[PDB]
Design an enzyme around this catalytic site. Structure first.
Site, short mmCIF file in Angstrom:
data_model
loop_
_atom_site.label_atom_id
_atom_site.label_comp_id
_atom_site.label_asym_id
_atom_site.label_seq_id
_atom_site.Cartn_x
_atom_site.Cartn_y
_atom_site.Cartn_z
N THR A 1 0.83 -1.21 0.00
CA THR A 1 0.00 0.00 0.00
C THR A 1 0.86 1.26 0.00
OG1 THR A 1 -0.24 0.11 2.44
CG2 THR A 1 -1.87 -1.18 1.20
N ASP A 2 0.24 2.40 -0.27
CA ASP A 2 0.93 3.67 -0.30
C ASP A 2 0.24 4.73 0.52
OD1 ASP A 2 -1.13 5.07 -1.77
OD2 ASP A 2 -0.27 4.38 -3.67
N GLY A 3 0.83 5.92 0.54
CA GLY A 3 0.38 6.96 1.44
C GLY A 3 -0.99 7.53 1.10
N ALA A 4 -1.53 7.18 -0.06
CA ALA A 4 -2.90 7.55 -0.40
C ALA A 4 -3.89 6.62 0.27
CB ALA A 4 -3.10 7.55 -1.90
N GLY A 5 -3.38 5.55 0.86
CA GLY A 5 -4.18 4.71 1.71
C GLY A 5 -4.50 3.37 1.08
#
Lengths: 136, 137, 136, 137
Positions: free
Chosen positions: C13-17
């Site tokens: 996953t990434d910081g955009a959720g």
């Protein structure tokens, strides 16, 4: 120290919104590789020869504060030779503009003769480069 | 708590030296942790989504004894211990499934913090309960 | 289809959720590797011999809906041989419990003789395995 | 918009076959995109933090022509085009910096959506402005 500048990319981050823990360790290894390249040493070269290897045998990292996508970080690297066979890289990762401390890390690396994987002395070229990088 | 996580080495786990990249072993450790959470019906995502707390990893370490290669089947054996009201500690051994050769040992430490102030808070009780693991010897 | 079960991990996953775009493509390659292993083929084997390679030469992916950490996904894989030298893997990635479509992808793979990197016929063992996996 | 992103190949980018792993080239493309954003003083993080919109990547493709190895210095050349009110398209070529050998070509498509409903929305004007790039020939 050698200072490695690193922007945080989206892929470095996780669903909690912040840099994923082992991506900081990735940035550390990058700093190490960049230092090698500046000293005209080449990880690829030793891998390619394969009478020897220079594996990482230990890594550890403490986290103090999170970073986010787009942040500009500095990884400050200094290195000391711990023994005939082994060196120790110390890293401090901070925010570039504020020097907010984000993490401190170490990696340890040893030279081995292949295929038997027995400790061998660090190449003098590595020793020489390490000497030029001042460690407390 | 204890857990055994089975992990195939994929091409992406390996590097140009022909072996598993150091950082990928640490990734496999976190996966074991995550698989244990799932087995205990706990969820990192639920923590994140609710946004009252975080469970950051505050320390990691790993020592490497021997390499692995693409296609290997590995076991990551995990033990979880509560170190304080607000901290727990995962201990990992990574081995070849078939030969039981020890490849690496590792530790990760995790703390619960209240947001946004980022102050230490007691572990969620369900997490404490899972770590205590009173259902098993 | 071959069905590969994949839990979403935090690192996916990434910081955009949500799952980072190319992590879905990673899951696709995993499904491919798992299928190979089920057919007693071995990517590591061909790499190790190195009179031949079987590189991925194309990848593409469309995204329809996001996934999150902890989700249980299914990657459904089917494969057709496109020519003497080339096969095409089709992937559909869905939520396991609802079959919500998340992504559709293709990877294409060719056999080459080394070191010159010239197209060679797919090994019959690969052809045989591909035949057993039914493609519309 | 156009951009040239310089990228060193690190050990982690490579795999057990001794070359850059296919998916890492796509990662380098997204980095070029991100570096271009930074050069234009735009921020993915600001979009996320405000939470009114998302800018998901909705399509990616890449073709591979030739391999790269650890230590190589690469150029990722990026062109950005607006395809609709709500969509833009990045086109990439990846080459060796020194020899100019073309290694790969790629495309990514990105759309702006309003949250939580996930309905198409017009690109943020600053993003449109950057893509138009009227400051340069």
């Amino acid at each position: 120290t050698f200072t490695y500048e690193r922007q945080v990319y989206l892929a470095d981050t996780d669903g909690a919104g912040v840099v994923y823990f082992n991506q900081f360790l990735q940035m550390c290894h990058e700093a190490y590789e960049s230092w090698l390249s500046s000293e005209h040493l080449s990880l690829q070269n030793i891998i390619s020869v394969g009478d020897f290897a220079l594996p990482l045998v230990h890594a550890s990292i403490d986290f103090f504060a999170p970073a986010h996508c787009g942040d500009r970080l500095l990884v400050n690297l200094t290195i000391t030779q711990a023994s005939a066979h082994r060196f120790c890289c110390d890293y401090e990762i901070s925010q570039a503009e504020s020097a907010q401390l984000l993490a401190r890390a170490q990696t340890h690396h040893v030279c081995i003769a292949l295929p038997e994987r027995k400790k061998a002395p660090l190449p003098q070229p590595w020793q020489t480069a390490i000497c030029d990088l001042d460690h407390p």
